[PDB]
Design a protein around this ligand. Structure first.
Ligand SMILES: C[C@H]1CCCN(S(=O)(=O)c2cc(NC(=O)CN3C(=O)CNC3=O)ccc2Br)C1
Length: 130
């Protein structure tokens, strides 16, 4: 219905606002663009499911997220890909991992303060009903 379409439009508006606030954080610049295949050849071979904030924006716009749960799966993938590809003890890898965990914690904390649980629950019930 029109009412359900209004619900998903509000969700996309919410998800773009949260994603924008992550993307302008200087700590998360590395997560704003896909890994450039030129600069990093073995990324696409090692990370099976690349994800970054530019892809999250594209997915919002293609209506790929019907719930904040589904969006947070992609935030969690940006973090787990970073931990997976940069696992070493050296400062380079420890910095990326620290940033990856801060992106995940910041997204979860924004949503905890600003997502109405009844709004999420409506999104889940419309999604389940399809
Ligand atoms: C090859 C690794 C270097 C450290 C960052 N990781 S990552 O897995 O945390 C990751 C990166 C990007 N995007 C970029 O690194 C984009 N980029 C370049 O490729 C060169 N400069 C630049 O900013 C996106 C998501 C993740 Br999870 C990739």
């Amino acid at each position: 219905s029109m009412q359900e379409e209004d619900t998903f439009r509000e969700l996309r508006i919410f998800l773009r606002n949260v994603t924008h606030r992550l993307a302008i954080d200087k700590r998360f610049r590395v997560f704003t663009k896909p890994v450039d295949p030129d600069e990093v050849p073995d990324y696409v071979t090692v990370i099976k499911q690349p994800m970054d904030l530019s892809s999250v924006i594209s997915k919002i716009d293609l209506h790929k997220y019907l719930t904040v749960k589904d969006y947070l799966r992609d935030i969690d993938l940006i973090c787990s890909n970073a931990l997976e590809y940069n696992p070493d003890r050296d400062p380079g890898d420890r910095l990326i991992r620290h940033r990856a965990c801060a992106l995940r914690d910041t997204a979860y904390a924004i949503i905890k303060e600003e997502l109405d649980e009844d709004f999420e629950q409506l999104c889940e019930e419309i999604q389940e009903s399809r």
